[PDB]
Amino acid sequence: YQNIFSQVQVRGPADLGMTEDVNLANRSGVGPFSTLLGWFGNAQLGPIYLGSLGVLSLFSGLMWFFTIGIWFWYQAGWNPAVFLRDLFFFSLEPPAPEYGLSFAAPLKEGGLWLIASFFMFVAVWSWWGRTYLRAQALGMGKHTAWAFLSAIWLWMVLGFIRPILMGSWSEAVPYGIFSHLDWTNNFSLVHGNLFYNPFHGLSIAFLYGSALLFAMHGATILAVSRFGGERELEQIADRGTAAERAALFWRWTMGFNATMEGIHRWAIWMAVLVTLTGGIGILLSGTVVDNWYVWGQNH
Amino acid sequence: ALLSFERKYRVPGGTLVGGNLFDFWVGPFYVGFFGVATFFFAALGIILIAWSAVLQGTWNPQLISVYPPALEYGLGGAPLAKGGLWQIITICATGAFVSWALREVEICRKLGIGYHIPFAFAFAILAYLTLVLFRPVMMGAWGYAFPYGIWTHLDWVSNTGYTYGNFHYNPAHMIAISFFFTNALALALHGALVLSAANPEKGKEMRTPDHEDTFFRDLVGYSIGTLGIHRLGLLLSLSAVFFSALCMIITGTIWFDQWVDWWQWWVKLPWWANIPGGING
Amino acid sequence: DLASLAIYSFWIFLAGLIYYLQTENMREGYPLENEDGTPAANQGPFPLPKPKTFILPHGRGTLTVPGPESEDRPIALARTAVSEGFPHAPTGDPMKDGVGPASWVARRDLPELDGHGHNKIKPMKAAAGFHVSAGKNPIGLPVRGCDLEIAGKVVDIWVDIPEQMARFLEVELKDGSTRLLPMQMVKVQSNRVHVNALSSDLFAGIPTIKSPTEVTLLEEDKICGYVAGGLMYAAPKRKSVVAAML
Ligand code: BCL
Ligand code: BCL
Ligand code: BCL
Ligand SMILES: CC[C@H]1c2cc3[nH]c4c(c3C)C(=O)[C@H](C(=O)OC)c4c3nc(cc4[nH]c(cc(n2)[C@@H]1C)c(C(C)=O)c4C)[C@@H](C)[C@@H]3CCC(=O)OC/C=C(\C)CCC[C@H](C)CCC[C@H](C)CCCC(C)C
Ligand SMILES: CCCCCCCCCCCC[N+](C)(C)[O-]
Ligand SMILES: CCCCCCCCCCCC[N+](C)(C)[O-]
Ligand SMILES: [Cl-]
Ligand SMILES: [Fe+2]
């Protein structure tokens, strides 16, 4: 038995969750129970907290998706068959260079893109506020909100900060499945190969490293789950043989190890540094460094 | 030196080979038969690389590079200076990686824990082997493998990719990337949640797992659970590597042209292939 | 050059972070000791971090780390060589003494509490509303050990109430008493529950719990360590795969 999938599922009264300082009035009712999910993790869905910040976020979120969707349907001649076969090829492009950073572009030539970006901007930041508040209501630390900022950073640099510093919305990313891939490839071409951007290489080390570390941590916990290993919070407060065997596996393997609490500090930074270094690398491209190959020759 | 709770665990037994011959430690490192095997392989490999550096004429870490046999050599052997050295070093690397895994297994047995870790690591090894062994062989030549050099291997990645246009269009590659991104997302989430619960607002008591399920339930309407999150992290990581190996194994063996063209099968579907309008109409 | 100044500053930062992370992961297990229990000469290049204090809910006090080692019980192991780095063999029965892969830690002899202060784990028969929702129900099945003999029968499932999951199977032995078996160490089949880590004659030896309605962290550790220890120490009584294939 490897404990990858549960052998027997057990169920009881729906769990409504801790109260603490949260406004119980904004909490929805319990959702259905999924036996399918129950084989892998919890079977219970909901309840969810739906305050004003969340409603606003969901609203802009939908408007963003709607704005893109209406442009795609327009590109499809309002033909369902065409909409589906060309779905990955449609693209909502930003204003042309001639428009700079103005909001003058006509709807079909950058205006819809600007609207789409406004809705996305509001959706993401309102959601970020939500991650902070939900932690505050339960008296928890703000580690989730902080980590989320790192991801927000790359996004901000790509569609707002860099375009603004470059002087035009045309520098931003289009909304499209294949189009945004073309944009990514072109971005490297235009800046003399990103493999030469030092921050791009670091970002890769952390992306690889996150898969490396989570495979390591996930496998470790499962390996000591026979000693209640996943109850990490209590293992932190009162170390057990699960924590000891886990630490010793690694100390005997690579000469050093972590603690039940400390491993989660290694984890959060490993992931967070992915977009932190990534954002810096992109922000420097085109504003300070035009060609990384050339740059590399002088450093 | 030992950790203050270590003694009771440094017990005999667990080895897969050599009985108690290599059953001992050196500082914090456990040895075992596979401990010495790893050392052997790693040393020989590093030595052969240093020799290849000499034949190349440099000691610069940024310049040293060992290339495999040129396409002319097919799947046969080659002169130590023209692909042969890479070939031996590849054997040593494989021997060292596998030995490292098997050493991890002995350590698992001695501690009475599961074998998940070495199992996970095997996925990494299998990814390496795909680029350096399985794909080259299926393609018919060792030349298709990548060179061992800090920057030279990046050139190989670039040239290999552009041989098929923009590699982004490789469907298996897309799935692999999704797994890498989602994994990093999950890793950040797990780290932050545990820490946010163990380190609540200054002056408050340690939160419980209940607070963790509640936080995410409040946030997205679903909580995977303390056991599931670890199960997920392992799955995403391995799936990312699994699909990496798959996206490459098929390139140059069953797919030869520009990856972007592969998507025509979807656009050319009978019921909408010829309908005018749209991007492809 | 801005790019150059940036990459230069990053490495300074990274080294500082690694330094921070490493010392932070030294809240437990340090200072390092010699194989005889005395402080080791080389404590490494990383100093101990300043103490932090965890405030534990429901009158469980506090926890301050780094702090003096908690472990102090007898370890039934004897040195095997004059030189450091070698195994320490069991002076008696490792399974009963709790050493090697059968080790257990002196965790608080109280049950783990949920967010309300209620016991986290409880036998299902007493867990209002809980039931097997999917998969083969283990209750009522005979339990087989690696020697391929029946060691008892399953009489209940101990569930984690807050996380709604099965944690232990309660097995009734021949003498009428019962023991708890960790879920991740059993294999529920269609006509039985197989336990590879233990031979039938070792079940009686599984550590017991004071109360029949709750289990403490101390007891869980003794139970889990003992069962795992069987993979190594019960190897002689574990019948081959082809033998079990009948
Ligand atoms: C030909 C193409 C170029 C190239 C061009 C680029 C470009 C361009 C960029 C990268 C970037 C990256 N590249 Mg590169 N790259 C190349 C080759 C490689 C190779 C390789 C060959 O093996 C690898 C492994 C990588 C790897 C990487 C990653 C390390 C990095 C992306 C990090 C990330 O997590 O972003 C994913 C994370 C995000 C985008 C953050 C998202 C956060 C927001 C808030 C999400 C909100 C979503 C929400 C509103 C909508 C959906 C909601 C639903 C509920 C789901 N590149 C080649 C040379 N690469 C990025 C970087 O940082 O570069 C330094 C970047 O911009
Ligand atoms: C996976 C797809 C490609 C590939 C694509 C890329 C791309 C694209 C990039 C890298 C980058 C790196 N690659 Mg690579 N790389 C490949 C296969 C390998 C193999 C291998 C044995 O299979 C190795 C050891 C490396 C090693 C390296 C590192 C030098 C560097 C950062 C990786 C990292 O932090 O990972 C996460 C792992 C950790 C955080 C653990 C620590 C690992 C340490 C740092 C590895 C040191 C390697 C050492 C110098 C190699 C020789 C060791 C002995 C002398 C033999 N690559 C395959 C062929 N690699 C990045 C770079 O900066 O390149 C210069 C980068 O941009
Ligand atoms: C211009 C180039 C093309 C392109 C061409 C390629 C090519 C070509 C390849 C990839 C591959 C990959 N690409 Mg791509 N790719 C592009 C753009 C991207 C972008 C992006 C944001 O645009 C992303 C995110 C990616 C992402 C990915 C990954 C899914 C995958 C590499 C990881 C891997 O396989 O790990 C697997 C992990 C390993 C191989 C590591 C094994 C390590 C071993 C086991 C141990 C080593 C130990 C070490 C020696 C120890 C030293 C001692 C020290 C003490 C540590 N690509 C562009 C369009 N991509 C690669 C792939 O899929 O590989 C199968 C690949 O070959
Ligand atoms: C499969 C999922 C992910 C994963 C998992 C993973 N890796 C693992 C484990 C796991 C679970 C371990 O248990 C093991 C470990 O101990 O980690 C601390 C390991 C490990 N992953 C490592 C690296 C690594 N993992 C990577 C990736 C991945 N690992 C995936 C993303 C990568 C990359 C590039 O993404 C790297 C670089 C090692 C740190 C460690 C294994 C240590 C080891 O094998 O040691 C024995 C060998 C030596 C000490 C040296 C041998 C050198 C050779 C003789 C020469 C080889 C030359 C080489 C082929 C070229 C190098 C030049 C490059 C510039 C190309
Ligand atoms: C069916 C609609 C699917 C369209 C969603 C497109 C997601 C790709 C987003 C890339 C945009 C990058 N960005 C935000 C920085 O501009
Ligand atoms: C923060 C992630 C950075 C990834 C590089 C990981 C380096 C591991 C260094 C180990 C240093 C600690 N030490 C000396 C005690 O072994
Ligand atoms: Cl903190
Ligand atoms: Fe964890």
GROMACS .gro file of C-alpha atoms and ligand atoms in nm, chain A residues 64-65 68-69 72 83 87 113 117 120 154-160 172-177 180, ligand 5:
model
   40
   64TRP     CA    1  -1.284   4.006  -1.874
   65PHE     CA    2  -1.371   3.664  -2.008
   68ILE     CA    3  -1.254   3.835  -2.502
   69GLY     CA    4  -1.540   3.602  -2.585
   72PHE     CA    5  -1.381   3.588  -3.065
   83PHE     CA    6  -1.588   2.960  -3.323
   87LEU     CA    7  -1.088   2.886  -3.101
  113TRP     CA    8  -0.809   4.496  -2.544
  117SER     CA    9  -0.715   4.455  -1.937
  120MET     CA   10  -0.854   4.167  -1.549
  154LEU     CA   11   0.537   3.883  -1.333
  155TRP     CA   12   0.183   3.950  -1.459
  156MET     CA   13   0.212   4.322  -1.375
  157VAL     CA   14   0.548   4.351  -1.551
  158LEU     CA   15   0.423   4.175  -1.866
  159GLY     CA   16   0.098   4.361  -1.926
  160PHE     CA   17   0.139   4.695  -1.747
  172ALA     CA   18   0.184   4.408  -2.399
  173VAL     CA   19   0.058   4.050  -2.450
  174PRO     CA   20  -0.249   3.967  -2.662
  175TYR     CA   21  -0.537   3.754  -2.530
  176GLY     CA   22  -0.522   3.431  -2.728
  177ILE     CA   23  -0.415   3.068  -2.686
  180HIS     CA   24   0.038   3.459  -2.668
  831LIG     C1   25  -1.159   3.131  -2.429
  831LIG     C2   26  -1.080   3.247  -2.372
  831LIG     C3   27  -0.940   3.200  -2.334
  831LIG     C4   28  -0.852   3.324  -2.341
  831LIG     C5   29  -0.766   3.336  -2.216
  831LIG     C6   30  -0.626   3.374  -2.272
  831LIG     C7   31  -0.517   3.348  -2.164
  831LIG     C8   32  -0.378   3.386  -2.220
  831LIG     C9   33  -0.344   3.511  -2.141
  831LIG    C10   34  -0.209   3.572  -2.177
  831LIG    C11   35  -0.227   3.721  -2.139
  831LIG    C12   36  -0.100   3.773  -2.066
  831LIG     N1   37  -0.115   3.908  -2.006
  831LIG    C13   38  -0.207   3.909  -1.894
  831LIG    C14   39   0.002   3.945  -1.930
  831LIG     O1   40  -0.143   3.998  -2.083
   0.00000   0.00000   0.00000
